[PDB]
Structure formats: C-alpha cells, structure tokens
C-alpha cells in the first residue's frame, strides 16, 4: 500500500525482477525464473503513466541486461586496450541500449492499453513484445540475446519449438506470465486458470518427434577442442604450434572417425597461404577414409580487384576433395557487431580512437548457402553467432541436411555465463529443426546435441581434448522448418490488429 504506489520503489523493484530473468538460462537452468521475471514486468507496469511505464520497462531491461550480458566485460577488459573505467561504461551502454526496447515495449503498452485487463496482458502485450523483440534483433544487425524462449529447452514448452519456433515460446511465456500477473494483482482466479491451461496445453507436444532416425547411416564424429589461448592465438609463431596441435590430435582419428570437425578459425593463417598444408592433409584424409571440416579465414579477390576477407568453413578429405576454387565452403554472413565489423563505421570513425574500434572488417557471405558436403554427408553450417539466429538457420536448412554444424570461439569471455547462454541457444536449433547439432569450440562447450535439443556427448571446457562419439542422422521436416516464423507473425498480426482495434474504442 504505502511506498508501492511510488515509482521509486516500483522502479527499484523492476531491477530485481529484471535480474531474476538471467537465472532462467543455461548456467542456472531455472525456467520458473523466466515466468517470475516476465510476471514482474507485467505487474509493475499496471496503473502507471506511459512515461512512467517506460522507465519501469527500461529498469526491468537494465536489470536483465545488467546481469545477463555482463560477461561481455570479460572480452572487453581482457583484450580491449582501453582504460578500466572506459570498459565499465561500454557494458553499461550496451545494457542501456538493449533496455530501450524493453522500455519501448512498456511505454507503448501503457499508452494504448492503460486499463489493466485481460486484453492488455494476454492479447496486447505478447503481440507488442514480439514486435519490440524483433526490433531489438533487427536494428543495427540486432542482438537477439537473452530471449526467454530459449529457457524452455528442457522445460515443458519445448514441444512448441519444432512447431512454431523459439519466438513462439516467449510469445506464449508473455501470455502465461501476463495472465498470472493479472490474476495476482486483481485477486482473480480466472486469469490463473487460463494461464495454467495455456501453459499445460503444449506439454503433450513434447512427446511428438517429427524425425525418423537412420541407424544405417550412423557415423563416428570426432570434434577437436584445441584450447588455444585467445591472447596468443592470432600471432606469428603460434601458427605452427596451432597447426601441429590440431594435426597431431586428428592423426589418430583418421580412418576411424568418418567426420572430423575443428573449431571456428582453427587455422589462423589465410587459406591462400596455407595451401601445402591443406593439400597434404586432404591426401591423408582421403587415403584413410575420413573427412575434415575446419574453420579458416579466407581472403578472396572480386570483380573490382579488392580483397574480401571471409570467415570460412573449408572441407577436406573423402567425399569432398579440397580446392581453393571450390563450392564446399561456408562464408559467415551475420558478423558480430564491434567484433567483426563496426556498425555506422562512417559515423563512428571519428570516435574510433580511444574506443578500440577494429580497423579491418570481415566480408559478409551470402545469406543463403548450400549445405556442406563431407563423406556423403550434408551439413548446415552456422558459424558461432549465427547459431542464435533461428530464422537464418532455417532458411539455409534443407530436407537433405543430415546434421546441423556449428563452430564457435568463446575463448574471449573465459569463465563466464556467456558461453553457456550461447550454447543454450544452439540447442534450440537442433530442437526446432529436428537435426543433430555438431558444435565444436576452441575451448567452449564442444558438444553433440540430439535432434530433440538433448546433450548426447559433451566435454569439459578449458581443456585440450577430442569429443569422439557416434551420432545417428535424422530425416523428416518439422512444421517450423516447413513454414518458419510466418505462422507466428500471422498470430502476432491477428493479436496485434485486434488489440489495436479494441483500443480504438
């Protein structure tokens, strides 16, 4: 009663509920925290002015992104070259920027739907939540991180992912949490029962498998985890050791593992320079009957006589003879902001000094690329950050795909919660597309994810070892793979258009 109508307490209480949402992700795996966090956001924005609701939404977002993506400081501080106070400011700015979309969501929600009714929390908010979440994941190439849909990878709503996708799970979570907040505030059991029923409906969907496994095509897949130090990785002198470490770890695996995978950019030197190594290595693999899929950095000429530096996945060995001018390669398309390219580079150039802005930039590969071929196996590649973009992976996905391929380098963030959150989003792609995921990392979570988003084999982080295990390919198309996000956007359009049309009266 007292000091709860006040915004100060209501603003401070939004940080706690925002920060409570970070407990729903991989390092902690508490999916009830996602419901409680969203329930707090819905309830705290009740009976507030549109500007006051935006402040609550911003502070809720600042709590979520002030503790959910605070691991970015580790990458910034370890190798940033910037003063300590400067590093702290950048992480705060990232949390503040991503909190604008949450602040925008709450500000718009209270403006058009001021009264606290079932329309606002069940029809209006989930439709508006996806629009604001889309903008967060689209503006300036986006950053679709800390989405509550990924928290249900092992939860009871995992069955809805292969049908509509991850963006529908957090759409449903907003419905359930909004109804729970409506029930709690107004002391009404009707929003509580409807929230329970809507949450319990997708439970039997998790026992439906859209894939038929293929026992006759079982292979042994070995993924080498180099554990190359990030600081010494891109150096002249560590190149010879890095090649020897991977080559000596891979040599015993030839002739026994049909598919061998190296982490992202395992070969640091340019592909045009490391030709004798790749040609000789391809000969060894083909003779013994194995294929290698390794990440590398390639600089290609073009029509205008320039160089386009790509983050490439080259394939060698049986079933894919190596050639510089070949088609069995994957160039990374969605570059990491400020890590591989500088957004607004024409505007941020004056501020590039005293900001550690990278002078060079990778070239973006085509949005749609053919699946990789290696020993008669189709792989849908997705380099590191691209494994969190469910729509892009689905577009590159094909019916002939056997496994989903992902190579990453999470050594920047060290011992933090970031690699796990990245790993959790990778598991959702396997669940959505019903294909096994072959994830290899320099020192991160190198694991084989099953067709239902289940960890089959995994190795501890920060170690130099190989993950040799048998994986069975799956065939069959999920409803998500057939349709995509458009069935959800129609639901968002139907909910959004109806909510606005109700607000127009």
């Amino acid at each position: 009663a007292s000091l709860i109508e006040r915004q100060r307490i209501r603003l401070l209480l939004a940080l706690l509920f925002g920060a409570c949402g970070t407990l729903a992700f991989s390092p902690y795996d508490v999916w009830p925290a996602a419901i409680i966090s969203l329930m707090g956001l819905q309830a705290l924005t009740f009976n507030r002015r549109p500007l006051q609701s935006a402040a609550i939404g911003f502070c809720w977002g600042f709590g979520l992104f002030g503790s959910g993506i605070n691991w970015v400081y580790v990458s910034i501080a370890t190798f940033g070259g910037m003063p300590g106070p400067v590093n702290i400011f950048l992480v705060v700015l990232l949390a503040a920027y991503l909190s604008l979309y949450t602040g925008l969501f709450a500000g718009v929600l209270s403006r058009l739907w001021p009264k606290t009714t079932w329309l606002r929390v069940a029809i209006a908010a989930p439709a508006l939540w996806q629009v604001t979440e889309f903008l967060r994941g689209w503006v300036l190439t986006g950053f679709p991180w800390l989405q509550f849909g990924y928290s249900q990878i092992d939860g009871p709503l995992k069955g809805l992912a292969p049908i509509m996708g991850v963006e529908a799970i957090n759409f449903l979570l907003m419905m359930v949490s909004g109804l729970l907040a409506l029930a709690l505030v107004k002391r009404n059991w009707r929003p509580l029962v409807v929230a329970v029923v809507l949450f319990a409906l997708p439970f039997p969907l998790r026992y439906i498998q859209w894939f038929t496994p293929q026992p006759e095509k079982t292979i042994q897949v070995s993924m080498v985890q180099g554990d190359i130090p990030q600081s010494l990785k891109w150096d002249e002198g560590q190149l010879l050791n890095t090649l020897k470490i991977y080559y000596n770890a891979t040599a015993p695996l030839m002739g026994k593992s049909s598919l061998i995978i190296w982490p992202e950019s395992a070969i640091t030197d340019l592909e045009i320079n490391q030709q004798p190594f790749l040609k000789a290595l391809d000969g060894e693999l083909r003779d013994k009957g194995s294929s290698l899929v390794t990440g590398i950095v390639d600089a290609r000429l073009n029509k205008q006589n320039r160089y386009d530096t790509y983050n490439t996945i080259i394939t060698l060995g049986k079933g894919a003879p190596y050639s510089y001018e070949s088609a069995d390669r994957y160039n990374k398309n969605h570059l990491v902001p400020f890590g591989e390219f500088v957004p607004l580079e024409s505007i941020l150039r004056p501020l590039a000094p005293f900001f550690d802005l990278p002078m060079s930039s990778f070239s973006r590969g085509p949005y749609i690329q053919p699946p990789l071929s290696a020993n008669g196996i189709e792989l849908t590649a997705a380099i590191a950050y691209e494994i969190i973009l469910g729509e892009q992976v689905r577009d590159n996905f094909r019916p002939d795909t056997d496994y989903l391929l992902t190579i990453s380098n999470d050594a920047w963030f060290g011992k933090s919660i970031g690699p796990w959150q990245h790993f959790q989003m990778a598991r959702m792609r396997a669940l959505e597309l019903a294909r096994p995921l072959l994830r290899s990392t320099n020192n991160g979570i190198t694991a084989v994810i099953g067709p239902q988003g289940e960890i089959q084999a995994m190795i501890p982080q920060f170690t130099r070892e190989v993950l040799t295990t048998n994986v069975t390919p799956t065939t069959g198309l999920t409803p998500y793979a057939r349709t995509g996000n458009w069935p959800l956007w129609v639901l968002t359009a139907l909910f959004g258009f109806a909510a606005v049309l109700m607000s127009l009266r």
Partner: peptide, 5 residues
C-alpha cells in the same frame, strides 16, 4: 572470430 594476424 577476431581478424588481424
């Protein structure tokens, strides 16, 4: 990823 060399 990190470019440079």
């Amino acid at each position: 990823s990190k470019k440079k060399k």
